[PDB]
Each structure stands twice: as structure tokens, then as C-alpha cells.
């Protein structure tokens, strides 16, 4: 017979689950400078090896269940760390599972043609040569949620056989002949233009740098269209020019190629000057008629909007350039204009 | 419409072009094709694509499943039932200490081990290989005296490991584990020793039926820790020791590996060193002039975003798009 | 909609030491000649060893039911009309039935809404039917703004408001000089919105 | 007074929660040729009675947390099993709760 209540033990569940999720999905992705090496356990010397980032320990106390409690506010240390290099990357998860789940995996894939000149070209009768080159660099053609230097680990890729497939519309011979004749005049000539329509250039920035100057010599700016810029981690954009670039010891996202930029909130101001004397928007258009003040931190004249630290001029410029919105009152643009890479969809104020 | 659309003569839809020239390299691969278009049809290049196949080795550091795979439910500090040498202070005397369980509840214990059951009238004994299986145990919550107990415990030869994530490949179809090394003609006999135990109270039982109360089957398995790493090794020194009993494990970080979205970078784009060539075979002047300033990959990415929704997955072009979980970027 | 809990399997806590109720045992060797003889081990093997007989000691908890019960309580039970809740014992409670303290120190018995309410039924509780449903801490529209201002008590702020009057919300103002005075409201209960409706004033 | 740390017991949470999802949502829907009849408990002879489909037991070892780990896979036994005759059917759930309980 038992006297009194039954012996039993207690445990908080929801708090424990929250701690587990928070630790697992954030605290392990802090910048390495906050983690410390273990005790009595041998670790890899190379910091890019999977082993180093796996056996490196990070204290749970940095991010416990009570971090910025009650507040919607991304951590400081993480907003510079790439967020796509994360084992919860839905697309990366899908692709990795689609290939399989083992270490050794045969594959049979179909690669499209992306070069804009021939991407949608309507090839006519004749005998045409067609040759292309393919990389076998694991660090380049593979993606890893941790970005570790794969070729140091021992990832390898080998091609067995490559074939070309093309589908012909079984067009009636008479109409096909008429179309072929009509498409070889001097007038009915096909045309194309690259969708980005750009001219990428890149500029190094030293560590702990604040200002970045830039110059272009006496060009001719005819039919110029506009600017577009962002910021990348040098440890990641890869040197496209040669073949194997030995030095690409990182295997995560490639914001120069994947289009997944994440360092866009680190810009402060932009100044544009033609002939070293005139400022381009400098017809007293903006509130600060010489700079595109993006985020002014200290200054409190009352120029920031959206209950954040982006200035009114910069917000107006972004909205105008993306959706022609701003001269007749701000309002959420339609989903049909705000694509996934559009400005508004990724604008997240915090406090 | 009836006429002037589809031809009646025997005409194919998909044509498969065998490569004519191919060259391997330590870091690249070149393929060349002779694209021939019939004399009465028009080919839309958009439908063309390069079909590849080969061997991909993801390497030792590809772990797509977060968390462990072996004894996940076990406590992260629970040690495998093991024996180990230990310095003895009684009277380099290295006595061995034993730590392990005994879930199986047999009938009788003799010098041939526990009596699993009876066959006809002859008592039957468990196989040294697997019969005291770790999984099968007593199935009554309320305690009942067990006068004959059996279980498995690793010998001191095998290194000690936490139960969390420890695994050793099986050797015989009955699901046992155990190094099958034998030094004879039939050099595959299992070396499983039976160790006997009784109550510490039973000391003056000479002549008395000092029956062994618990019999342990000792093994030597090829223990592995595939996806877990020790998070706390109390003592730097190697070997097996009472100190090492408290080591705790932890699952290794998840790590996914796959191809780039839209197979980015697999083809050589915007590098005039290795530039694709398309030209009428009569001449040979390449009709694809590519610069290093243009960025074709990003351009195609933005174009795909512009046309279709960038959330549906198309497995053919490997069109799944990278994206973070918004509850992770912003806490 | 209480579809129940998928707790088919049992969930067990365990000792972090692998096992607890061990029994101290001594190794015993078979004798010679005597089939039933047995002599204690003299060769080096520590005569005191911890071994467990039978299954390991453990405790049980239904996780998937506890999660549902906590959710039900924290999201419905605390929001029942006050006439059901009873005041606590030996605790000094406020008197104003609108002060946050009164809404916080009032204890509502879990038995009103537990795991077994309308089992398998899609049916809002009659009591909660008339209770304002937006006055709830799960109000995403409220939560977004509350975190947008910040999680502190003392919050410096900077906002932009629109002009909503239909007659001039879209007037195309032609050139000239105009006066555009407008009033504003300082009442806390009107410009601030609480999840519980407590009288901020 | 207590000497040393406090008494405590450990339980893996997320792993156990997944066992259930898997078990209770898949392992009970495997074709009957895998499930085996119970012990010392009666059961209807008719294999279409609810009692037959309920009393019959299926070992958890068939589908535990470690099945095809990391692989976006559908169990072979479940490829031909009807996937709509499942208690998670949203439409069926709605239509059943609409009438009542």
C-alpha cells in the first residue's frame, strides 16, 4: 500500500524543446571566434576541414532560451554569417535527398544551356559544331551546408559518358521550308539580350575597412541604364577565370552565382561624382542632395522610416526603382510585381 | 487544324547525339558534338540539354540526417556494458572490474551456461554466438526474483564507448556481433567466453551448492562510432580505465551535399579560357563570344525568378532554390 | 478540434548512468571433476562487480498528450470568462476586475478544459464563443507590432501615420499655400492595444 | 544537505517524438502480411472487421527512427497501399467532424 501521493519526477517540456531547437539551429552556427577547442580530444589543424567545425564546442550559454526574450531581433553575430549555409536550407535539403542519402552515388542528370545568345536560338538546317567544357571541381559544382573544403575531405566526381538530346517539333515539311526561307532574310534576324544586362566588376575591401573609393576613366556614358551593387565575402566568391583555382577553400553558397546575397545591410552611404565636381542626383533631389544615405545610425533629425534605421530617401529610391511607387503614397506592391528577389519581400525591420 | 502542321514522313522527335571528341583532365572535362539539323525542320535550342552520368563520391563528411542513428533513445552518458583492467590495491596486480546487465531470465545455470529451455527431456543451452540477445528481456514491470540471469558484455580488449551511437557490424545471420577470428583450418570460429558470477554473500559455500547466479557472455566486437563524437573525455590517456567509464557522446553536426541549384557552375560559363563553341561546320569561327565581365549564372537565376515562381521544385533541372528558415535568421 | 494524441508507443525516462539498482557480485569458476562444484575466482578479477539483473529502472511519461494539454490550457483555459475562475487562497489579489493583476492571479481549474474535451469533435467551447477572440496572446497582428516596437517597458519610438479621411486621402492638391492643422489623441487606452484588455490607464 | 549534483534522469525528446510520428502514422498501415497475430487474446476471423485491423499487432522495429535515414523515400510496402485510407486525411477529417463526433 502507498501512503501519500505517488513518487514522481518533473520536467519542463516546451522550454526544453525550445532550448533544443535554439541551440541546434543557431548556437552551432556562430562565428568561430566565439567557440573554443575541446579538452583531451585531438582536433584537425585545418580550420576548413569538417572535423574542425564538428569537434569545436560552443557554449549553450551564448544562446539559451532567454536570449532577447520577447523580442523579434536577429542576433548580432549571425547577420554577417551566411544564413544559407544551414542544414535547414529547404532547397539544399531537397537536392541532397534527390541525389540519394549514401556516400557513393551514381547520378544521371540533365543540364540546360544558359548562355543568352543561344539559350533560345532557333537553329536552322545545317551541320553545326557544338562543344562545351565541364568542371570536375568538387568545391565548385557541389554545395555543402557547412561550406567545408570538400576536396580536403575526399569528395570526388567522375564522368562516365555525356550525350546530347534535342527535341524537334514534327513541323509539316512545307511550312517548315517556308519558315526556313523566311528566317534567312536580312530583316527577319533573331535577337536576344541577357536578362541581367550588366557588367559586373568587383573591388577588394580590406579587413575592418570603412570607406571604399572607386574610379572609372573618361568613359562615354551613352544609353547607360543604372547602378546595382552589393557586398560579398571574399572567402566565397570564387575566381572564375581560370580553371581550377586552387584557392577556393569553401563550399557553401555562392552569392556571386547563386544570387543569394546576404550582406546588403552593411552599406552606409554612396557618393556619385562625375568629372570630380558634379554630383549625379545633385539637382537637390534627395534630402541629402549629395549622398544616398542608406542607414544613418546616430543621427536623429528624424529621417529614418519603417520604425527602422533606413533613411527616407533610400527607401523612396528603392521603392521607385523596384515598383515605381513613392510619388503617390507608399503601399504594399502586388505579389505580381514583388518577385522572390524583389526589394520589398526581403525588407525586415527589427528592434 | 488539319493540314500544314505535322509531317507524314517518318520523322523523329528526340535525337540523341553521340559525342565525337572528348577529353578528360585532372580538373576539367571537354565534350564536343556534331549538331545536325534536318533539311526540313527547325530546332529550338531551348529544348537541347547535356545528359550526363557517372560516379559521384560524396566523401566521408556527408551526413544528411541530423542526430544519430544508433541507440538514439539511450541516455547520452550510458556506457556500454564493458569490462576493463584496473590497478588493484588488495595485497602490478591488474584485477578486472565488470559493469553490465542481465535481462534474460533463464531456467537453470550449469557449466555449459544458462539453460534456455528443454528439448524432449534433455536440457538445452544457449548458443555462444547470439542466443542471449540484448533485445529480449523480462516483460513484467513488478519485480520478481530471478535466480538465473544472462546477458552480454564486451571484453576489455574492445575499446569502451558510450551507448549513444555505438554500433558494430553483425557477423552471423542470427544477428550477433563478434570478431570471428580463429587460428585454425576453419579459421572462422567465434571466440566467445562465458563468465560466471554469484552473490558476494556466497563465500563459505565450499561443498554447498554455490550455484552461479548470473552468467555473462563475453564478446569482442568491432565497435564503431560513425556519426557521433565524444564531447567529454575525462582522461587524456588511452586504453580502458574506470575513469573512462564516464565519457559522454554527442551526434555530429548535420551536413548536406548536393549539386548547385540549376546545376550552377557545372558548365563552364563566362571564362574565356574554357569557352563553349557553336559554329557552322562549313566554317569554324565560333559564334559564342563570351567575356569575363558578364555573369551568365546570376542572369539566368534572375530570369527564372522573373518568369516562374521560385518556390516550386522541378527535379529535372535541379531547380530547387536555396532559402533559409525565417525563424532561424530572425529569432 | 481535439483529434487526440498519437501516443501509441510508450516514452521512457532513464537513468543517466545506464543503470542504478546494481548488485555486487563475485566471479566464480567451475570446479574440477565435481560437475556441480564451484569455487570463487582467485585469478585476478576484482571480486566486487556491479551488475544489474533484469530490465533497467525507468520512468514513463506520455509526451504527446502533455504537449496537447499544455497547449489547450495555455491558449484556451486562461481565457475563459471570469465567472468560472475562483480566487486563490492566502494570496493578496487586486480588487479592480480590470487590473492586469486580477487577470493574472485568478486561478482556473484545468478540469474545465483538459485533453478529453469534445474528443474527436470540431466544436468551439460555448463559453469562449462570445469572448473576444482577438484579445489573445496568439494574435499575430498584435504580436508583430508588439515585437516591432521592442520587448522593453521603456520604448523610445518613431512612427509615420497616414491621413485617412476619404475627402482628402487622394486629393490632387494644386499649387498654393494651405493650412493643414490636425489633432491627435493622448489617451493610453485608445492608442495602445493590449492582449488582455486590462485598463492601461 | 545534498553532496554532489542533484538526482536526475535523462530522456531524448525529439527522437522519441519522432518515433511516435512514424510509428502511429505509418507502421500501423503496413500490409497485413507483416503484422502478426497477438498472444492469448481473441480476434475476429474475418480479416475485414475493425476488430481484426485493431487487435493485430505490428513490431515497431520495421519502421523506427533509423529507416532510410536522410533519404526522401517511400516505404516499398506502402507504395501500393492506399494512401487516402489514412486517419490523417484532411478531407475525411473535416467531413467526419462536420457531422459531429
Amino acid at each position: 500500500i502507498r501512503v501519500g501521493n505517488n513518487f514522481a519526477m518533473e520536467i519542463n517540456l516546451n522550454a526544453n524543446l525550445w532550448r533544443n531547437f535554439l541551440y541546434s539551429n543557431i548556437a552551432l552556427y556562430l562565428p568561430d571566434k566565439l567557440k573554443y577547442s575541446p579538452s583531451n580530444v585531438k582536433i584537425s589543424d585545418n580550420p576548413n576541414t569538417y572535423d574542425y567545425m564538428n569537434k569545436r564546442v560552443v557554449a549553450p550559454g551564448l544562446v539559451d532560451c532567454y536570449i532577447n526574450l520577447g523580442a523579434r531581433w536577429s542576433l548580432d553575430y549571425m547577420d554577417n554569417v551566411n544564413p544559407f549555409n544551414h542544414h535547414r536550407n529547404a532547397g539544399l535539403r531537397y537536392r541532397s535527398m534527390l541525389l540519394g542519402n549514401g556516400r557513393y552515388v551514381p547520378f544521371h542528370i540533365q543540364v540546360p544551356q544558359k548562355f543568352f545568345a543561344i539559350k533560345n536560338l532557333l537553329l536552322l538546317p545545317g551541320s553545326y559544331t557544338y562543344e562545351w567544357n565541364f568542371r570536375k571541381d568538387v568545391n565548385m559544382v557541389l554545395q555543402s551546408s557547412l561550406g567545408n573544403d570538400l576536396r580536403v575531405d575526399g569528395a570526388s566526381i567522375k564522368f562516365d559518358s555525356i550525350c546530347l538530346y534535342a527535341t524537334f517539333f514534327p513541323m509539316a515539311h512545307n511550312t517548315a521550308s517556308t519558315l526556313e526561307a523566311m528566317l534567312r532574310n536580312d530583316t527577319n534576324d533573331q535577337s536576344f539580350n541577357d536578362y541581367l544586362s550588366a557588367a559586373n566588376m568587383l573591388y577588394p575591401i580590406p579587413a575592418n575597412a570603412t570607406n571604399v573609393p572607386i574610379s572609372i576613366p573618361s568613359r562615354n556614358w551613352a544609353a547607360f541604364r543604372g547602378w546595382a551593387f552589393t557586398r560579398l565575402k571574399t572567402k566565397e566568391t570564387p575566381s572564375l577565370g581560370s580553371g581550377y583555382d586552387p584557392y577556393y577553400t569553401y563550399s557553401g553558397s555562392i552569392p556571386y552565382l547563386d544570387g543569394t546575397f546576404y550582406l546588403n545591410h552593411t552599406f552606409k552611404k554612396v557618393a556619385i561624382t562625375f568629372d570630380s565636381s558634379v554630383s549625379w542626383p545633385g539637382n537637390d533631389r534627395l534630402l541629402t542632395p549629395n549622398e544616398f544615405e542608406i542607414k544613418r545610425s546616430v543621427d536623429g533629425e528624424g529621417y529614418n522610416v519603417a520604425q527602422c534605421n533606413m533613411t527616407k530617401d533610400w527607401f523612396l529610391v528603392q521603392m521607385l526603382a523596384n515598383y515605381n511607387i513613392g510619388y503617390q503614397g507608399f503601399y504594399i506592391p502586388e505579389s505580381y510585381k514583388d518577385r522572390m528577389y524583389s526589394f520589398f519581400r526581403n525588407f525586415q525591420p527589427m528592434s | 487544324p488539319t493540314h500544314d502542321v505535322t509531317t507524314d514522313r517518318s520523322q523523329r522527335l528526340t535525337l540523341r547525339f553521340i559525342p565525337v571528341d572528348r577529353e578528360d583532365t585532372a580538373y576539367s572535362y571537354k565534350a564536343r558534338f556534331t549538331l545536325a539539323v534536318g533539311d526540313n525542320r527547325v530546332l529550338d535550342m531551348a529544348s537541347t540539354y547535356f545528359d550526363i552520368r557517372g560516379v559521384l563520391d560524396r566523401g566521408p563528411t556527408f551526413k544528411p540526417y541530423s542526430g544519430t542513428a544508433y541507440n538514439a533513445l539511450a541516455p547520452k552518458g550510458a556506457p556500454n556494458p564493458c569490462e576493463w583492467d584496473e590497478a588493484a590495491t588488495a595485497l602490478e596486480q591488474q584485477k578486472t572490474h565488470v559493469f553490465g546487465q542481465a535481462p534474460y531470465s533463464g531456467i537453470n545455470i550449469t557449466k555449459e551456461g544458462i539453460q534456455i529451455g528443454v528439448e524432449g527431456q534433455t536440457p538445452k543451452y544457449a548458443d555462444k554466438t547470439f542466443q542471449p540477445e540484448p533485445q529480449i528481456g523480462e516483460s513484467q514491470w513488478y519485480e520478481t526474483e530471478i535466480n538465473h540471469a544472462a546477458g552480454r558484455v564486451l571484453k576489455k580488449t574492445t575499446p569502451m564507448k558510450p551507448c549513444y551511437g555505438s554500433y558494430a557490424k553483425p557477423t552471423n545471420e542470427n544477428g550477433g556481433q563478434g570478431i570471428l577470428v580463429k587460428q585454425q583450418n576453419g579459421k572462422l570460429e567465434s571466440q566467445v567466453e562465458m563468465q560466471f558470477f554469484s552473490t558476494t554473500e556466497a563465500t563459505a559455500g565450499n561443498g554447498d551448492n554455490l550455484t552461479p547466479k548470473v552468467v555473462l557472455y563475453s564478446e569482442d566486437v568491432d565497435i564503431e562510432t560513425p556519426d557521433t563524437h565524444i564531447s567529454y573525455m575525462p582522461t587524456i590517456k588511452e586504453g580502458n580505465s574506470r575513469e573512462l567509464m564516464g565519457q559522454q557522446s554527442m551526434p555530429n553536426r548535420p551536413n548536406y551535399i548536393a549539386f548547385r541549384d540549376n546545376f550552377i557552375g557545372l558548365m563552364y560559363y563566362n571564362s574565356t579560357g574554357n569557352m563553349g563553341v557553336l559554329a557552322g561546320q562549313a566554317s569554324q569561327l565560333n559564334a559564342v563570344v563570351d567575356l569575363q565581365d558578364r555573369n551568365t549564372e546570376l542572369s539566368y537565376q534572375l530570369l527564372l525568378d522573373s518568369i516562374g515562381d521560385r518556390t516550386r521544385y522541378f527535379s529535372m533541372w535541379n531547380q530547387a532554390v536555396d532559402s533559409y528558415d525565417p525563424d532561424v535568421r530572425i529569432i | 478540434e481535439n483529434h487526440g494524441t498519437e501516443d501509441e508507443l510508450p516514452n521512457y525516462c532513464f537513468p543517466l548512468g545506464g543503470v542504478i539498482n546494481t548488485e555486487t557480485l563475485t566471479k566464480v569458476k567451475p570446479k574440477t571433476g565435481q560437475e556441480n562444484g564451484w569455487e570463487k575466482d582467485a585469478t585476478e578479477f576484482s571480486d566486487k562487480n556491479e551488475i544489474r539483473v533484469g530490465n533497467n529502472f525507468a520512468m514513463e511519461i506520455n509526451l504527446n498528450a502533455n504537449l496537447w494539454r499544455n497547449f489547450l490550457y495555455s491558449n484556451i483555459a486562461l481565457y475563459l470568462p471570469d465567472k468560472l475562475k475562483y480566487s486563490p487562497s492566502n494570496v493578496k489579489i487586486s480588487d479592480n476586475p480590470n487590473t492586469y493583476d486580477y487577470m493574472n492571479k485568478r486561478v482556473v481549474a484545468p478540469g474545465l478544459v483538459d485533453c478529453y474535451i469534445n474528443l474527436g469533435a470540431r466544436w468551439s467551447l460555448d463559453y469562449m464563443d462570445n469572448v473576444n477572440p482577438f484579445n489573445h496572446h496568439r494574435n499575430a497582428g498584435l504580436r508583430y507590432r508588439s515585437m516591432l516596437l521592442g520587448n522593453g517597458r521603456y520604448v523610445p519610438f518613431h512612427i509615420q501615420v497616414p491621413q485617412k479621411f476619404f475627402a482628402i486621402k487622394n486629393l490632387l492638391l494644386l499649387p498654393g499655400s494651405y493650412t493643414y492643422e490636425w489633432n491627435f489623441r493622448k489617451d493610453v487606452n485608445m492608442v495602445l492595444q493590449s492582449s488582455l484588455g486590462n485598463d492601461l490607464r | 544537505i545534498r553532496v554532489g549534483n542533484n538526482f536526475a534522469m535523462e530522456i531524448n525528446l525529439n527522437a522519441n517524438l519522432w518515433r511516435n510520428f512514424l510509428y502511429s502514422n505509418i507502421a500501423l498501415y503496413l500490409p497485413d502480411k507483416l503484422k502478426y497475430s497477438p498472444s492469448n487474446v481473441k480476434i475476429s476471423d474475418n480479416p475485414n472487421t475493425y476488430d481484426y485491423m485493431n487487435k493485430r499487432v505490428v513490431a515497431p522495429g520495421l519502421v523506427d527512427c533509423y529507416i532510410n535515414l536522410g533519404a526522401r523515400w517511400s516505404l516499398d510496402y506502402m507504395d501500393n497501399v492506399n494512401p487516402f485510407n489514412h486517419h490523417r486525411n484532411a478531407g475525411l477529417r473535416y467531413r467526419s467532424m462536420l457531422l459531429g463526433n
Binding site: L17, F21, S335 | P326, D327 | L67, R138, A140, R143 | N14
Partner: peptide, 21 residues
């Protein structure tokens, strides 16, 4: 119910109009 109940509630919220007029 393993989550942060954040984006989860907003996603529950997404059961409303989107594409056109």
C-alpha cells in the same frame, strides 16, 4: 507541435487572396 509558433502562425494565416483582380 515542434516549433517556435511564429512563422507557423503567420503561415496558418495564409489562407487568403493573392494573384489578381
Amino acid at each position: 507541435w515542434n516549433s517556435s509558433t511564429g512563422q507557423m502562425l503567420r503561415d496558418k494565416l495564409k489562407e487568403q487572396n493573392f494573384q489578381q483582380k
